Design a protein around this ligand. Structure first.
Ligand SMILES: [Ca+2]
Ligand SMILES: [Ca+2]
Lengths: 237, 229
DNA sequence: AAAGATATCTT
DNA sequence: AAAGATATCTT
């Protein structure tokens, strides 16, 4: 499948290469800082050619957002079937020590999942899968080409997984003012395996479509999956 | 001085990719998210070089949502610290200049050292003009750059601050909306840093609230006449 | 505009 | 946890 091939190619590339700096055309190399804003940019850039290669191998077109502030990082589709599009989005978080619990912010809950054309490259309904490539890294002068192995890398270990967004979605927000879905707070294994909390993608969608932006508003409705299932039991009242 | 040396070093000092230790190069994306990361990484060695030359220790933040990107100080003068923060935008200008509800209202909020320890707050602002999914080999000249040209300036934060917010839910100060030249020259709107700070320390978050207080510099000045009521 | 998206972190 | 910072762009 595209999905096993992509997984395999990402896992592989991640093991065979370590990014250590940005290079100028004149050949000066600048090292990397160890902030997730640097590492998410790097990981996104490192992934693009792999997605592209595996996509070509299966006849999919890859499109990236033309405008900024649009989901997804990559839309793949076969020209023959334009309405069965796949959304791939890259997410990153850090760990201080391998094997700690991690969590991701999984995108806004008030944009495309509530309004089919808000902040998304194609209408939401044209997508049949939303995959998350998640990167987890353990956080840890200019140089010349002759020094590539000498530059200190700003991370100790990097792990990557591909999983469906609904599968790893949690029931608490990942951010307040920017209203993001929070993922499960779990070990890396759990993301790989897909040990989430929702039973279907329909349940995930109904929960985040009806989630209220503040706890004073949520106090009356639901604040987690068990209160949501009770709320549903009783007739959404 | 440190400031003229840094400005000279920045003007004096073109990135086309990230490189792996194995020598494969991955090209650069087009979003400002990519380029803000690149211009910060580009400036760190410059800043550190100049700083060293003038006897200043440079410190980056440990926590990821703290200001500033670089704190510079002589260990002999620790309440004469300098804040340098890198800001980026594109042209096919205005900058967002940081929150107005964190350290300017609360001395230790989201800042590496207490706000009172800093004697200057410089902005290095990069402006790039907007214009591959293959990897390259150490082919550098064949790699497409995602930008057509880049300009940089160093200026004091108060001189280029505007009077309209630069963002809504993340409550940022907006700069003057001006030509590159005006930022270089420092053709701002506030009379002093004292006025810049009092305007932003009392700026209300929404238009509702603002409509009974002030929305721009003329209205703030009239609010001062009124007795800050 | 002014308001709210894009992504992730900190307490 | 919930809420609000970090940076910048879009409508
Ligand atoms: Ca994305
Ligand atoms: Ca900064």
């Amino acid at each position: 499948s595209l999905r096993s091939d992509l997984i395999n190619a990402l896992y592989d590339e991640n093991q065979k290469y370590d990014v250590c700096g940005i290079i100028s055309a004149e050949g000066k190399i600048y090292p990397l800082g160890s902030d997730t804003k640097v590492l998410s940019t790097i990981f996104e850039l490192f992934s693009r050619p792999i997605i592209n290669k595996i996509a070509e191998k299966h006849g999919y077109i890859v499109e990236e957002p033309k405008q900024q502030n649009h989901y997804p990082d990559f839309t793949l589709y076969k020209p023959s079937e334009p309405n069965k599009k796949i959304a791939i989005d890259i997410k990153t978080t850090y760990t201080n020590k391998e094997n700690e619990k991690i969590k991701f912010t999984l995108g806004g809950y008030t944009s495309f999942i509530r309004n089919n054309t808000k902040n998304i490259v194609y209408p939401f309904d044209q997508y049949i899968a939303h995959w998350i490539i998640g990167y987890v890294y353990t956080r840890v002068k200019t140089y010349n080409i002759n020094e590539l192995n000498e530059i200190p890398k700003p991370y100790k270990g990097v792990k990557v997984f591909l999983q469906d967004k609904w599968v790893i979605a949690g029931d608490l927000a990942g951010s307040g003012n920017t209203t993001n879905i929070g993922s499960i707070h779990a070990h890396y294994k759990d993301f790989v395996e897909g040990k989430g909390i929702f039973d279907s993608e329909d349940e995930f969608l109904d929960y985040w479509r009806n989630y209220e932006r503040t706890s004073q508003l949520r106090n009356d409705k639901y604040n987690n999956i068990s209160e949501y299932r009770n709320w549903i039991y009783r007739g959404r009242k």
